[PDB]
Amino acid sequence: MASLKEIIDELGKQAKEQNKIASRIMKIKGIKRIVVQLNAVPQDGKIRYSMTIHSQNNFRKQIGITPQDAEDLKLIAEFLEKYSDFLNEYVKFT
Amino acid sequence: GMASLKEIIDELGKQAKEQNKIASRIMKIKGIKRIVVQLNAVPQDGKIRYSMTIHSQNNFRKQIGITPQDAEDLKLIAEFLEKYSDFLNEYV
């Protein structure tokens, strides 16, 4: 896995050089469906960086995240685990 | 608890059937600050199927679809954010 610095630097150059958003799907060990991207976003004559999560089935639907979202993500995982058997048995998902 | 969630699920299906639309309810998860879970009752040709989506509370269009099987992915994302917190907070 590349360092966060190696990623930010490369995307920043791409964004500056191409004057567009440059993104990379992050390779995080064990993450199988949810996609995590780093984005270099040109704005106000400089480059800004963001981290976003997506499905592998629609990238335009996304949530921007920061370390401050860590607890929320864990609480959601805990909810899913708590009710996993119930939901899988009681409802048909689409 | 499960008993409440069961009733919420049935009532959400009823609403979707009666109002001819997707009906949604935000799940009551204690301690959430920003990213909330929504249950959706989705009509498909006289059957109700369900979906779950997570959203930013400050902008519900910012969302992704999830299932119970995604618990591990969410924990791994959280753990990544924790491990690299200092760098991310400074350079994001």
| Resolution of the structure in the document, Å | 1.8
Residue B8 contacts A where some CB pair is shorter than 8 Å: no
List chain A domain ranges.
Answer: 1-94
Residue B44 contacts A where some CB pair is shorter than 8 Å: yes
Give the fold, CATH level 3, of A1-94.
Answer: 3.30.720
For residues A94 and B6, what is the distance between their CA atoms, to the nearest angstrom?
A: 18
Instruction: Note whether A52 and A65 are within 8 A (CB).
Output: yes
Instruction: Note whether A77 and B75 are within 8 A (CB).
Output: yes
Helix (H, G, I), strand (E, B) or coil at B16: helix
Tell me the technique behind this structure. Answer: X-ray
Q: B85 vs A45, A67, B82, CA distance in Å?
A: 27, 5, 5
Apex B4 CA angle, A94 and B9, nearest 5: 25
Cβ contact B65–A66 (<8 Å): no
Residue B45 contacts A where some CB pair is shorter than 8 Å: no
CA–centroid distance for B82 within its chain: 22
Q: Check: CATH 3.30.720.60 for B1-92?
A: yes
Cβ contact A77–B75 (<8 Å): yes
Q: Of all helices (H) and strands (E), which one includes residue B29?
A: none
- Residue written as token pair 């360092």: A3
B54 by Cβ neighbours in 10 Å (0-12 / 13-18 / 19+) ranks as buried
What single string gives the DSSP state of each residue in A29-83? Answer: TT--SSEEEEEEEEETTEEEEEEEEE-SS-TTS-EEE-GGGHHHHHHHHHHHHHH
Cβ contact B77–A76 (<8 Å): no
The residues, any chain, with a CB within 8 Å of residue A91's CB and separated by 6 or more, are B9, B49, B50
